[PDB]
Every structure is written in structure tokens, then in C-alpha cells.
Design a binder for this molecule. Sequence first.
Ligand SMILES: Nc1nc2c(ncn2[C@@H]2O[C@H](COP(=O)(O)OP(=O)(O)O)[C@@H](O)[C@H]2O)c(=O)[nH]1
Ligand SMILES: Nc1nc2c(ncn2[C@@H]2O[C@H](COP(=O)(O)OP(=O)(O)O)[C@@H](O)[C@H]2O)c(=O)[nH]1
Ligand SMILES: Nc1nc2c(ncn2[C@@H]2O[C@H](COP(=O)(O)OP(=O)(O)O)[C@@H](O)[C@H]2O)c(=O)[nH]1
Ligand SMILES: Nc1nc2c(ncn2[C@@H]2O[C@H](COP(=O)(O)OP(=O)(O)O)[C@@H](O)[C@H]2O)c(=O)[nH]1
Lengths: 431, 426, 431, 426
Amino acid sequence: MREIVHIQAGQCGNQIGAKFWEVISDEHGIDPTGSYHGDSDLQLERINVYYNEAAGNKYVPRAILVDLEPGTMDSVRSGPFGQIFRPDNFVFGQSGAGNNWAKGHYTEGAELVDSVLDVVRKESESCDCLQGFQLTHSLGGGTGSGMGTLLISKIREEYPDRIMNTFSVVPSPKVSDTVVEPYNATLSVHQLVENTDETYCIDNEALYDICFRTLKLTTPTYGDLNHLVSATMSGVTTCLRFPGQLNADLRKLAVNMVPFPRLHFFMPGFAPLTSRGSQQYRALTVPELTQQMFDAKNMMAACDPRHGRYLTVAAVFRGRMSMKEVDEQMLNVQNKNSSYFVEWIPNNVKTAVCDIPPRGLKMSATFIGNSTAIQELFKRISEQFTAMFRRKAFLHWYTGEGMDEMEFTEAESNMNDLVSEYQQYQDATAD
Amino acid sequence: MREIVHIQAGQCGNQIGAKFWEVISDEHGIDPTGSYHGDSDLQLERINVYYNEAAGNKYVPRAILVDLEPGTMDSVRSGPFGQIFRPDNFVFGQSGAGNNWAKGHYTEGAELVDSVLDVVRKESESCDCLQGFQLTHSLGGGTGSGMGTLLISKIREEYPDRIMNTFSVVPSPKVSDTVVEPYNATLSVHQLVENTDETYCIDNEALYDICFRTLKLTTPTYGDLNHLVSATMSGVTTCLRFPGQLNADLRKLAVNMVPFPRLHFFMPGFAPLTSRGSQQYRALTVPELTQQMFDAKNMMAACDPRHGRYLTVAAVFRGRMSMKEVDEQMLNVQNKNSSYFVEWIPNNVKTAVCDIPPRGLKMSATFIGNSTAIQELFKRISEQFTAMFRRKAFLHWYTGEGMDEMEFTEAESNMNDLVSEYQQYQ
Amino acid sequence: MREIVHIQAGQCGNQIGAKFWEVISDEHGIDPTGSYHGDSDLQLERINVYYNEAAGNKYVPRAILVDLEPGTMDSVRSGPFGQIFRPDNFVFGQSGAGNNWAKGHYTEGAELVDSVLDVVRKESESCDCLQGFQLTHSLGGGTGSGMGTLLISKIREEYPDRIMNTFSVVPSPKVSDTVVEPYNATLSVHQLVENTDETYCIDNEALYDICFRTLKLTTPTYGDLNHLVSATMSGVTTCLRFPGQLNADLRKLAVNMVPFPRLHFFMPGFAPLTSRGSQQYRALTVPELTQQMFDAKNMMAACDPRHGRYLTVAAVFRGRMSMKEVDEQMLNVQNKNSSYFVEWIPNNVKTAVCDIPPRGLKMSATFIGNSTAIQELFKRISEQFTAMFRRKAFLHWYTGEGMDEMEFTEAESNMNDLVSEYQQYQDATAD
Amino acid sequence: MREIVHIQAGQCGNQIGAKFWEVISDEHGIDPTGSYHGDSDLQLERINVYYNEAAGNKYVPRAILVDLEPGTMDSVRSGPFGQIFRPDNFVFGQSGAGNNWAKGHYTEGAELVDSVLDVVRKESESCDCLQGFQLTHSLGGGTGSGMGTLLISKIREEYPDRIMNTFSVVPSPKVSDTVVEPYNATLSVHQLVENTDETYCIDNEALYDICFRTLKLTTPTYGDLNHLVSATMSGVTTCLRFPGQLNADLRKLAVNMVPFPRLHFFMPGFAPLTSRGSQQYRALTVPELTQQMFDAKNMMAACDPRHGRYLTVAAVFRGRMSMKEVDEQMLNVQNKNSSYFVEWIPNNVKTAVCDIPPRGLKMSATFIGNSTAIQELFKRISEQFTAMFRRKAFLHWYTGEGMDEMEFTEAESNMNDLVSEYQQYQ
Ligand SMILES: Nc1nc2c(ncn2[C@@H]2O[C@H](COP(=O)(O)OP(=O)(O)O)[C@@H](O)[C@H]2O)c(=O)[nH]1
Ligand SMILES: Nc1nc2c(ncn2[C@@H]2O[C@H](COP(=O)(O)OP(=O)(O)O)[C@@H](O)[C@H]2O)c(=O)[nH]1
Ligand SMILES: Nc1nc2c(ncn2[C@@H]2O[C@H](COP(=O)(O)OP(=O)(O)O)[C@@H](O)[C@H]2O)c(=O)[nH]1
Ligand SMILES: Nc1nc2c(ncn2[C@@H]2O[C@H](COP(=O)(O)OP(=O)(O)O)[C@@H](O)[C@H]2O)c(=O)[nH]1
């Protein structure tokens, strides 16, 4: 019924989406060949949310892979679960963006966007009732940032009422993996704040902090980070696929989480997360899930939520639970820690409970927080962008692709307006 | 997907290119006869980046050999891996350069550049998507400097949007191997600063220092210096050939590394480098690679980076690693040694991680630093150029080949303007 | 219901706490793997006093281990019962205090106290009804003294009405194991007298005297001393865990034992204690327990109670007993030896009787005496501190950590005030 | 957790350090090749205190060798356990010290200290938590005295809060091995009393007395004196490596032992020491260890402690023991011999008990005494220094290297002030 078109863009985003499809196919009992070998009847009851049936009991993921270089495409094709994707959906150029937003947004992505949109339209025509779109990409890259923003603009133009969800990997506060990361991030945010319904802020540095501090991993690979991001992704759209005591689709989350049209950048989280050894010392109760969810050191975005206030909070639980216990924990958190929630919104937390827990767990819960502490991320990116743009650092690389400097000025102005709005709404007396 | 055309010009350029192709053929399992005898599918998955497939299960390096004298080409053709190149790509004249930039750029190189460009265009037509070119040459000689700068100008005119990379051997601060090195070096920089995308500064003085202090080599010949240079060359383009956790090809490296169009002169480095005796006493960890990379005594350019400040830094790692450990080491380096980085650029270091280590190593990492300390090289070259030009020393050898004093004055002015810019951003 | 948070600090204190948890797990039938393999139903009826259940019938001790050096932590992890502790509760630095109170209290312990308090808050949130806290440490050391006093101050600030009990190892009268023991002891007492509800004075020298004189041990190890201290610890909180004819929790003992807010330093004791051979010559009757309890040579604090008067006395018995016999013995002791009890307090002895004796015994009894003879300990420590401070002996080691000399003066003044108070209340005519 | 960097400077320092590393490698089961062949998990549980793990199941001692002459280093490298050190840590010059403090401190040591400090910082960066440094050197020579004092000053400036321990061989009261021992000794104490945390006074005279009277050795070479010194060195830091009933690391030892910042010169001792013949006639009990420890004829410093009074006393025991027996013996010693302890410090002796005895022994104990009787050493050194300086004997050899008479006067004044303090507290 309610179907989601997943779009992969860039190395940082498509590389996640591969792990995401691994996890999703594991949840629904679909082996790396597309054949169904599950046990529970509920696995195929809502299988069409992500999977088209391919006339012979093979299920094909409704996914579209976009990049400007075929290397990541070959890597995805050769790896595990690379044989379930439809070969027609691997749309890729030959040049590559080179971490240049202007390039990937105006020349190479502009040449490839027509084929990408043809594939998107073909996937949307095959649907029963299109719920929305799902994009995975990074903000500080090339293909990812520019190509994803271009695709979001195009699709928002074509489908104005569908849901546009993006899981964006944001720049890290300490270590940057791209020398021009501020420009790409600022331009990508300027494009995102105008077209997306909700966007999730994944920060790699926070993911390494979680892997070392909580999971006690000494050698964490990108498999683990992509697995955490994919667990978040699966927890988001769980209510669309399995029944539960309280259902909450993407639109319900968007309504309950976005108070004003521009404040839609969320801090995702996940629980439970334990090391391999500490499993035998932790009982799994709803209070434990609640304690780990509302934890600053558990956020996947490198922004301390204790430095701001929560506008809205989504808490999607999974597994057999008591509604009284979940409601009790939410209310106790709101009452005991009232100094961290926005005053002019009563009942800040949205609650959803599903019946089917993730693979191997008795129960879990996905945290989605809309906190004003994301102004830290935005202000840091704005200050770095100003420091680099004042000297025109590497500005010629973007002006040589036909991009205007006034466009950079407008993007900086929009970023600062978003920062000022986030600051305006926190610490605003409800009187 | 992406393909590279390699052009090697000069005696030094041909030697470094022969060693480079030996190393590259070893990485992809291509024996000296062109046959493939590897053991991993990744070796053939992206082999077309450097190799054209001549039907018959044989691969031919997409390399073009340029020289004004046939001796170096004969030595290259007769040696090991000399039978792997295409015989049509040995484009050489008969006159010789004579370590004269004027000669090699206006008379002999001008007579040979038409055939060289014919070969270049033929090689370019056989690609699916041309990524860019690489020029291996030295700035001290006649064929290298003049011929390579002429070829760079011609190709930049023909291909204005492709990546132009050059691996230039720069004059040494202690002992020159050519009496007229300042003239050739200045006249070559006058073209390189205008036509190239990124230039890697390699100095034989720093290579001898590495081979002696670090590798503990009693008798290092050029077979080892060229091997170090080839290790750098292979580490630069490892993201175009093998998969990894975080990719960064030539275009993205040039984007992250060059803040302003004229400041594109880099200091390459490599780690790990250990002697055979000290090999059993050193644990190979990512912090060790990070410590050896950002080391002044490990730079392949004879310029102390501690006398300047880093604009941008590239750190391409190879082998199974953790993203978190690499990022933590980069952040520790940026924080603890913040006084050597320009304050107007946050997060100077841009990293990349490949999943395939070099042959025989568990892991390694190539350092590419764009430091303002490179202004010392240009200041020394400009001082020597002025000292020689104020007395017209060896000047008739260049004015008798078609040049004039106005061109030398313009080259000196461009060199000094580059110096002034590098000092301005420090 | 009533739960206790045990906190281990320092080598001298954590080293006890290991033996304490061995004994407690033996009493409740919990093997070194956390599994329950007891016999009596009463062992699990009040198991939550010390143990959190870990979702699978494994019980985890509600203990927190604190030190400034990981050596003792590794020793505890590797030894027996080291696998029942939760790995998240091993909070340790890297430097070490070096028997410097100023260091461990102001720099290293100050750096570690935030993590320690986070663990403490997490343990307190999981409780049903927090009764109080329990600290085991030494006064003449580094991590022990300074770190424990800092933790006591922090927790007293956060939880002002909970019970703060500390089992402190005090300096010995003859042999000192630390050259700077007077300074650490004086500063630790200055901090303790202001925040703790009751503190027990364990002296090693008295423990060797008991081991040689009474137990007839020729080669007593710290296993035996820690075992005696742990037997005392278990006898203190027995009424909170097993039923009895007279129940007396920690708060009842604190009320009946501390007449004035500053006089809360107790002299613990234990009975019966016999050698291996003399067991066949001693009948175990309540009069025998009473005779051994009120014995100066049986005190675990190296202070002769015959040199002072008893303000209050606690006598917690264990095992099947006649109430008439216990009351008769208490009354006979008060009447025949009236010259050793404070005149202005009638009925100096508090009586508590539990039904379950310790492991292997038919019955026992724990002595807790609040005698004015502890002024001997305090006056000796004050005189040694004065003798060392007059010459500024090793004072630079503490002033180099940012500590003020006026703070030493204040600590000495408070110590002397405590001595003067103890002397004021004894030999004070009740007329 | 805690880690130590060992620095050995001079011929005497290098010999003692080689023997020390032999003993330490024997304790942790590390064979001369670096491979681990122990039989107890406790050997590897805290092996990182002295050993860096070079990946490959090999351990490398965290030791730095310093000398101004390559002969001693060649002898160390060629001998047994010479292959266990890292080859990069042999930092040596070519000139030689010549038993001249001025030379080794201002010219040759000054030329070498930059490389030595580079190695020191490299070793320090590889630790989790640096506990402190140990310097093994002699006060009579040129490399030892001058180079070690220079290194101590440099490191104290770089690391102001780490534990600086030195194991100094002091001049003998009967026969000097260098004609200018007073000058070097005074100029070295002038730095040691200012920059170190604790200094252990070892005298070869007392070591010969021990080897003859106690061990009944007819022909004791330095292979035995260095073994005694190494036994002391290993007993000092045994609480950092093996668990025990009562721990006391370097920081707590320095806290308990040094009452005033300048009185940090200790008299090390060791027990049990028995000949092979008398071994079958002596029962090994804790009272026997206590009796042999507090014995004037057992002190490794040639100063009779019965002529002074003890400020503080450290007694680190090793092996399975009873806390009560050790405490009773300490109390008996303090009570029966109360006239040798300062009355203004109660409970002078601070003890520590480790659960692992030395190799081959059931139990042992290391004595560390801070006695005011050490003023005899400084009085003798000051008398000899004054007698030589009043006539400018051998003075030109030090003034021709950059020193002046003002510096000698200041060193003499500092020595005499230390003497005056030690007498003041007696
Ligand atoms: N979490 C995660 N982040 C990644 C991964 N690969 C790359 N990144 C991040 O993405 C950024 C690089 O952008 P990238 O997407 O590779 O450039 P693009 O391909 O041109 O869009 C860096 O900051 C990396 O930290 C991955 O597999 N997982
Ligand atoms: N790294 C390296 N440098 C070389 C080699 N051969 C020559 N050079 C350097 O290049 C300079 C000589 O220029 P060269 O290229 O031989 O003159 P050309 O033939 O006219 O280009 C000298 O300064 C040499 O130090 C080589 O094989 N490797
Ligand atoms: N009863 C007992 N006392 C101990 C034990 N270990 C150390 N002590 C005493 O504690 C004092 C040393 O203080 P310590 O706690 O080790 O120093 P810290 O670790 O810095 O706090 C000495 O007086 C010892 O007698 C033990 O296991 N049992
Ligand atoms: N214990 C010990 N003392 C030594 C050894 N070698 C030399 N000494 C003493 O050290 C003094 C010589 O100083 P030395 O260190 O050799 O001079 P340096 O090389 O300039 O530091 C003499 O008084 C010797 O008695 C040794 O192996 N062990």
C-alpha cells in the first residue's frame, strides 16, 4: 500500500544504502538472491513497501543508485546482496564530481539528472500509493551533496505532496574529511531547508564516539557505522511494515515532529546498544531503553542536546511492551528534566510502539529528537564558511563551473537565518 | 570509468617512468611480457586506468615516451619491462637537448612536439572517459624542462578541463647537477604555474637524506630514489584503481588541495619507511603512519615545512584500517601542532582510505602537503637566477636559440610574484 | 525495597570490598558467575538490597569501584568473583595519587569524580527506595582518603537525607604504613566529621592483635583481616536482608548510636572468634557472645575502651536466640560495669536480633560501640600532625597541588575541636 | 596504566643499564631476541611499563642509550641482550667526554642533546600514561655527569610534573677512579639537587665491601656490582609491574620519602645477600630480612647511617609474607633503635609488599633510606672541591670550554647549603 522510493546518491550515501538493504532484506527474510525464505507471515504482508515482485517470487528492492563515478557502483554490484538490485536502476556517469558542489550540481549531475528522473518516474508509476521518497547522502561531498540536492529539487517540483526524507551525513566538528567541506555543507543546507519534509543529521564523529564509548569497539569499520545508520533507518519506517499497538507512518512523524516549516533537522538515536561482554549485566526493560534514548552521549549527531531545548521528540519503540510502562517513562522524563524541553509545547514526546522487534533483540526503540542544539552544527558550519569565503579560498573551483558568488552570499544568508530562527525559538518564554 | 595517459619526458623522466611502470605492473600482476598472472579480481577490475588491452590477452601501458636523444630510450627499451610498452610511443629526435631550455623548447622540442601530440591524441581517442594526464620530468635539464612545459601548454590548450598533473624533480639546495639549473628552473616554473593543475616537488637532496637517515642505505643508487618516487606516484592514484572505505580521485584531490589557482605546488611524502634492521623493532599502527607522515625529515622536497604553514593537506591511506583511528590521529595532529596551519582554513587535512595495501606491506599512507614553506625553494631559485642574469652568464646560449631578455625578465617577475603570494598567505 | 549503593575507593578499601562481596554472595547463594544456587527461600526474598537482576537470573552487585590506578582494578577483575561485577562500574584513572591527599582530592580525583558521580546517579536511578550509601576506604592513603572524602561531599550534596556510612581504616598507633599518614588522616577526618552519618574505625594493628591473640593465627594474611572486616560489614546490614525477632535498619542504628551530630565514630567488634583447636572447648551461649563482645582486646579499633565511657552501644545478634537471654546479658553488663557507661544516658545498649546466623555458625553477634576512648586515636593523630606540620614536613608536596596552608590549620583546629568535644562529654556529671 | 622511560648515559650508566635490562627481561620472561617465553600471566599483565610491543609478538625495551663515544655502545650492542634494544635509540657522538664536565655539558653534550631529546619525545609519545623517567649514570665521569644533568634539566623543563629518578654512582671515599672527581661531582650535584625528584646514592666502595664481607666473593668484577645495582633498580619499581598486598609506586615512594624538596638523596639497600656456603645455615624469615636491611654494613652508599639520623625510610618487600610480621618488625626497629630516627617524624618507615619474589628467591626486600648521614659524602666532596679549587688545579680544562669561576663558586655554595640543611635537620 504505502510505498517508499529509496534513492542512493554518492559514496557516503550509497555505501549506507547497501547496508540498509542488507538489513531490510534480513528483516523480511529475503536472501541475497531475491528469493523469500522467511518464517513469519507478517514478513510478506507489507513487503511491497520496499519491494517490487518480479514475476516468479523474486523480490526486487525499490531502490535507485546514483553516482558520477562507476567505482562505487562496481563495488555495490560485486558485494553481498548486490544481485538483488535491478540492473536498470544503476544510473552513473563517468567523470565524477571531485567533492565540488558546483560541478556535481550544475554540470555532471545536470547531465545525469534526466536519466535519474526517468528511473524515478518509472519506479513511481509502478507503485500502488506512493508514500514518499527516501534519500541517503552526505553533505560535505561531491555527487552526494550536489546531486542529492538537485534530485530533491526536481522531485519536489514533480511530486509536491509526497514525503521527502533524507538521511544526511553532516560535517564533523573536529576532523573534516574534505578540505572544501564548509562550502558543500552550506550550499547543501541552503538547498535542503527549502524542499525536504524532514532530514536526519548523522555525524561520523558521533558514530565513532558511540562505537568506542558504548559498543566498546577498538577496531570499528564503516560496516559498523553504516549498520548503526541502517538500524536507525529501519526503526524509522517500522510502523509502515509491521503491525503494532500504536502506528505512526512517515507523515505522522513529520506532523508531530516539525512545528515550523524550516525547523526539520533531527538528531536520531538508537537503543539498546551494549558491548559484547556487558550484555550479561544489563536487564532489558522499557526504563532502560528510555534512559539510553534520552542520553546526550548516545546521539548520532555530534551536537550536545543539553545545550538547547527539545521542540519535539519522537520515540518509536519495537517489540512486545506495556503501554503504561512507555507512557510512564516518557512522562517521567518530561517532568524530571523539564528544563530541557520547550516551554510553549506541552507533551513534547511522540510515542509509537510496534510489535516486531529487530533481528535478534527482544525489543528496541529509535530516538528522533528535534532539538534547538542543532544550531551548534549550523553556526559552526556558517563560521567555517565565512572564514573560508572571506579569503575566497578555493572559490575559483566553484565559480569556474558557472556558479555565481552572489549564490554563495545567498546561501550564507539562509544558513544564518536558520541559525537565528533556531536561537529565537529556544529560551523564548511561553508568556 | 576513469583513465589516465602517462607522459614521461627527459632522461630523469624516463628513468622515473620506467620504475613507475615496473611498480604499477607489479601491483596489477602484469609480467614483463604484458600477460596477466595476478591472483585477485580487483587487479583486473580497474586495470584500464593505465592499460590498454591489445586483443590477445595482453595489456599495454598507456604511456608515451618523449626525449630529444635516443640513448635513454634505448636503455629503457632494452631493460626489464622494456618490452611491455608500445613501440609506436617511443617518440624521439636525434639532436639532443644539451641542458638548454631555449633549445629544447623552441627548436628541437618544437620540431618534435607535432609527433608527440599526434601520439597523445591517438592515446586519448582510445579512452572511455579521460581523467587526466601525468607528466614525469625534471626541471633542471633541457628535454625535461622545455619539452615538458611545451607539451603541457599544448595539451592544456587542446584539453582545457582535464587534470594536468606533473611530478617535477626540482633543483637541490646544496649541489646542482647542471651549471645552468636556475635558468631552466625559472623558465619552467613560468609555464608550470600557468598551465598545470598540481605539481609535486621532488628533490634528490631530500631523497638522499631519506635513503641515508631513514632507510640506512649505504649505497643508494637512482634505482632506489626512483622507487620512492614511484611509490608516491602509485599512492597518489590508488583511489582510481582499487576500492576503499573513502575514495578520493585526482579531481577531488586537486579540489581539496589547491585553495588558489596559483598555489598548487606540493611536498609529497611516504610512510612507512624502515631499514631492514629496525623493521623488527617497530609496530606498524595508524598512529605510527601519522607520526612518520607529518615529519619534516620525511619530506621528499628539500624544504623544511616547519619554516612555513600548511594551506591544505592530503593523507591517502592504504590497507585495512579504522576510519575512527585515522580521523582521531588527524585531529590530534591539527590540535597539538596548530601553529603550523593557516588559521583561515578549518579542518586542513583531507583523508582517503583504500582497502588494498602496497605489495608486501600491511598498510601505508601517502602524504601530499601544500605548505607555504615551499617559498624557500622559489626564493633560492630566484636568488640564483638573479645572480646569474645580472652578469648575462650563459645567456647567449639561450638568446641564440630565439629567446630574448624580455622573456627572462617576465619569468623572473612571475617567480617573484609566486614567492610574494606564498609569503602573503603565511 | 531498602537498597544500598556500595562504593569502593582505594587499594585499602576496594581490597576489602572484594572480600565483602565474596562473603555477601556466599550468604545469598550466588556463585562466582552471578547465577543463584542457594537453598533457603529467604536468600532471594531481600536480594535487591545489594543486587540488581540482569534479565536472565544473573544478579549483579550494586557496587562501584573507584581508584586512580588500574592495577588494583585488574587484580579485582582477575580474582575470584571478579566476573560478577558490572564492567561499566570500574571507574579508574591512569596517574595515581601517590598517598598524597591534596593530589587525589584536588587534581586526579577531581578529574575522575564526574565519571564516578555519573555511575553513582545511574545506580541510584535503578533503585526502588534508596536507603543509603556505603563506602570502604582508608584514611592514611591517597585515592582512598581524598577520593572518598570528595565522593562523600558530592553525594551528601546531591542526596542530603540518605544514609552515608563509611568503613574507614584508621592509622595504627605503633606502625605507620605511610610516611605522610598524619596529614592524610587529619584532612580525611576534617572532611568526614562534616558529611557522614556514621563511620566505623577499623585499625589494622588491632586486627593483627585479634588474629594472633584470639584466632591463634601465626601467618595471618590480608585475606583474614579483610574477612573480619567483611564479617563486620555483613553483620551491620543483616537486619535489612533477613527477618528476625527485632529488626534494625541502618537508620535505626544511626538514631540509637549517634547522640550528637559530630560524635559518630564507632568501634566495631565481632563474636564468636575462636582458634581452630579451641572450638571443642567453648560452648556457644548468648552469655559467651556477650562476654566476648564487651572485651577491650576484641575491639577492631586500636583504642582501649576501658580508658573512656560508652555513649551508645549497638549489639546486633544473629541466629535463633532467646530474647530473655540477650536482654539479661545486656542488663547484667550495664549493671556490673556501670563505671564504663555514660551517666546521662540510661539504657546505653541497643539490641537487635536476626534469625539467620552467618555461614557455618549456629549464631553470632556484631558489636558497634560509640565510646569516648576514640579521643585517644584523634589526639594521637592530632599530635603527630602538629609535630610534622610545625616543621612543614612534606608540606610542599601538598601545597604544590594548589592546596592552602590555612586549610591545614583549619583541619587541625577541627580535629582538636572533635577531641575536646569527646573529652567534654565523658566524665561529665549527670547533675 | 603507568609506563617508564629508561635513559642510560655514560660508560658506567650503559653497563648498569645493560645489566638492568638483562634482569628485567629475565623477570618478564623475555629472551634475548625479544620473544616472550614466560610461564605466568602476571609477566605480561603489566609488561608495558618497560616494554613497547612492536607488532609481530616481539617486545622492545623503552630504553634510550646516550654516550659521547661509540665504544661502550658497541660493547653493549654486541653482548648478550644487545639485540633486544631498538637500533634507533643508540644516540651517540664521535668526540668523547674526556671526564670533563664542562666539555660534556656545554660542547659535546650540547651538540648531542637535540637528537637525544628527539628520541626521548618519540618514546614519550608512545605511552598511555607516562609515570616518569629513570636516569642511570655516574657522577665522576664526563658523559655521565654532564650529559645526564643536561638531559635532566631539559626533560624537567619539558615534563615538569613527571617523576625524575636518577641512580647515580657517587665518588668513593678511599680511591677515586678519576683525578677530577670533585669538580664533576660538585657540578653535577648543583643540578641534581635542583631538577631531580629522588636520587639513589650508589658507591663502588660499599659495593666491594658487600661483595667481600657478605657475598664472600674472591674475584668480584663489575658484572656483580652492576647486578646488585640492577637488583635494587628492579626492586624499586616492582609495585608498578606485579600485584601485591600493599602497593607503592614511584610517586607514592617519592611522597613518603622526601620531606623537604632538597633532601631527596637516598641510600639503597638489598636483602637477602648470602654466600653459597653460608646459604644452608640461614633461615629465611621476615625478621632476617628486617635485620639485614637496617644494617650499616649493608648500605650501598659508602656512608655509615649510624653517624646520622633517618628522616624517612622505605621498605619494599617482595614475596608471600604476612602484613602483621612486617609491621611488627618495623615497629620493633623503630622502638629499640629510636635514637637514629628524627623525633619530629612519627612512624618513619613506610612499607610495601609485593606478591612476586625475585627470580630464584622465596622472598626479598629493597631498602631505601633517607638518612642525614649522607651529609658525610657531601662534606668530603666539598672539602676535596675546595682543596682543588683554591689552587686552580685542572681548572683551565673547564674554563676553556665555556665555564667561569663564578659557576664553580655557585656550585660550591649550593653544595655547602645542602650540607648545612642536612646538618640542620640532624
Ligand atoms: N558513515 C559513513 N560515512 C562515510 C562513508 N563513506 C564516506 N563517508 C563520509 O562522507 C564524506 C565524503 O563524501 P563522499 O560521499 O565520499 O563524496 P561524494 O562521493 O562525492 O559524494 C566524508 O566526510 C566521510 O566521512 C561510509 O561508508 N559511512
Ligand atoms: N629522482 C631522479 N632524479 C634524476 C634521475 N636522473 C636525473 N635526475 C635529476 O635530474 C637532473 C638532470 O636533468 P635531466 O632530466 O637528466 O636532463 P634532461 O634529459 O634534459 O631532461 C639532475 O639534477 C638529477 O639530479 C633519476 O633517475 N631519478
Ligand atoms: N585491612 C587492610 N588494610 C589495608 C589493605 N591494603 C592496604 N591497607 C592499609 O591501607 C594503608 C595504605 O593506603 P592505600 O589505600 O593502600 O593507599 P591508596 O590506594 O592511595 O588509597 C596502609 O596503612 C595499609 O595498612 C588490605 O587489604 N586490608
Ligand atoms: N657500579 C658500576 N660503576 C662503574 C662501572 N663502570 C664505571 N663505574 C664507576 O664510574 C666512574 C667512572 O665514570 P664513567 O661513567 O665511566 O665516566 P663517563 O663515561 O664520562 O660517564 C668510576 O668511579 C667507576 O668506579 C660499572 O659498570 N658499574
